[PDB]
Design a binder for this molecule. Structure first.
Ligand SMILES: O=c1ccn([C@@H]2O[C@H](COP(=O)(O)O)[C@@H](O)[C@H]2O)c(=O)[nH]1
Ligand SMILES: [Mn+2]
Ligand SMILES: [Mn+2]
Ligand SMILES: [Zn+2]
Ligand SMILES: [Zn+2]
Length: 297
C-alpha cells in the first residue's frame, strides 16, 4: 500500500540557507521523521563516528528525502534551525541503531534529540519477548523478517571505498549521484519499517515500552563527549537488564519449553505431528487412514 511509495521518494539536496528553511517547515508539520548520518571514514576504525558530512531525513509529511549537507551548511547553521525540531518530543525520530549517531549529534552538533525510537532495538525487543534473544539484526534481516522485502544491492563502489578506509570518502563536493542515492537509502527503509512496527495490533511489544528503552540509549550516548563504556556487553546485542526492565521477561517455545524459538518454529512440534505411513499425509496414522481402511469411510 503506502509502503510501496516510500522507497520511490526522490532526494533533495539541502545545501543553502533558503533550502534549509524550506525543509524545516516541511519537517515541522510531521509526526515521524526517519534520521541517519553519513560521516567521514576514520583511519583509526575506532568507535566514534567521523566528521558529520550528511544528515538524512525522511518524514511522513512530504514524499521526499532531505539530504542536509552539514559540511557545506556548517553545523552552526544547520543546528540553529533544526534544534527545536530535534528537541520536540511530540515528533518521533526514527533510527536504526542510534548509538553512534546520537553520540555524534551530541559531540559534534551539541544537540540531544527527544522522542527517539530505535527500530533495530524495536526488533530485538520483539525477539526478546518471544524467544529470549537479545541480539541485534542488520537492516536487511529486519526488512525481510518484518516486511518480507529484500532491499536492493548497495553500490559496491561506495561500499568498497568505505570498507577500504583510506579516505574520508564523504568529503568530496559536489557528491556524485550514486553517493547521494546511496545516502538516501537507509532513511527510506527506516520510515517504511515504522508502518509495520508502529500502530500494529499484531506487534507483541508496545511502542511506549520501546520508546522508554530507546530513551535510555539516548541518555547513555548523548553526554556531550565521547562514550567510553558501552551500554551493551557486545556491539551486536541489547543490554539484557534493560530488556527485562522495559520489555519484561524473555519468552520461549510454548511447545518444548526451550528459549530461542517460538512454537511455529519448533522442530519437535513439526517432527512430532502424526504422519500417515500409508498415504503420507500429516494429521492421522495408518490405523486411522481411510485410504488404507475403507471400512472407516
Ligand atoms: O526447534 C527449533 C530449534 C531451533 N530453531 C532455530 O535454530 C536457530 C538456533 O537455535 P538453537 O540451536 O540455539 O536452539 C535459531 O534460528 C532458532 O530459531 C528452530 O527454528 N526450531
Ligand atoms: Mn545509521
Ligand atoms: Mn546510513
Ligand atoms: Zn520448541
Ligand atoms: Zn493415510
Amino acid at each position: 500500500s503506502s509502503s510501496s511509495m516510500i522507497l520511490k521518494y526522490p532526494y533533495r539536496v539541502v545545501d543553502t540557507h533558503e533550502k534549509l528553511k524550506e525543509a524545516v517547515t516541511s519537517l515541522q508539520g510531521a509526526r515521524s521523521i526517519a534520521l541517519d548520518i553519513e560521516a567521514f571514514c576514520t583511519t583509526d576504525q575506532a568507535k566514534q563516528l567521523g566528521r558529520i558530512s550528511l544528515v538524512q531525513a525522511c518524514s511522513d509529511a512530504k514524499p521526499v528525502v532531505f539530504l542536509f549537507d552539514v559540511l557545506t551548511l556548517t553545523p552552526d547553521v544547520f543546528v540553529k534551525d533544526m534544534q527545536s525540531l530535534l528537541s520536540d518530543r511530540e515528533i518521533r525520530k526514527l533510527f536504526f541503531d542510534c548509538r553512534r549517531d546520537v553520540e555524534a549529534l551530541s559531540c559534534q552538533l551539541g544537540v540531544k534529540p527527544e522522542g527517539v525510537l530505535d527500530l533495530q532495538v524495536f526488533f530485538t525487543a520483539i525477539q526478546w519477548k518471544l524467544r529470549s534473544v537479545n541480539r541485534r539484526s542488520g537492516m536487511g534481516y529486519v526488512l525481510k523478517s518484518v516486511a518480507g522485502l529484500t532491499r536492493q544491492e548497495g553500490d559496491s563502489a561506495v561500499q568498497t571505498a568505505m570498507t577500504l578506509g583510506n579516505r574520508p570518502v564523504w568529503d568530496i563536493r559536489p557528491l556524485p549521484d550514486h553517493f547521494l542515492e546511496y545516502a538516501a537509502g537507509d532513511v527510506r527503509h527506516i520510515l517504511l519499517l515504522s508502518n509495520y512496527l508502529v500502530g500494529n495490533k499484531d506487534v507483541p511489544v508496545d511502542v511506549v515500552a520501546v520508546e522508554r528503552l530507546t530513551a535510555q540509549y539516548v541518555e547513555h550516548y548523548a553526554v556531550g563527549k565521547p562514550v567510553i563504556t558501552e551500554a551493551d556487553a557486545t556491539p551486536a546485542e541489547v543490554n539484557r537488564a534493560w530488556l527485562e526492565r522495559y520489555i519484561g521477561p524473555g519468552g520461549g517455545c510454548h511447545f518444548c519449553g526451550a528459549k530461542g524459538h517460538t512454537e511455529a518454529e519448533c522442530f519437535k512440534k513439526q517432527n512430532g505431528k502424526a504422519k500417515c505411513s500409508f498415504c503420507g499425509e500429516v494429521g492421522h496414522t495408518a490405523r486411522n487412514c481411510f485410504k488404507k481402511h475403507p471400512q472407516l469411510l
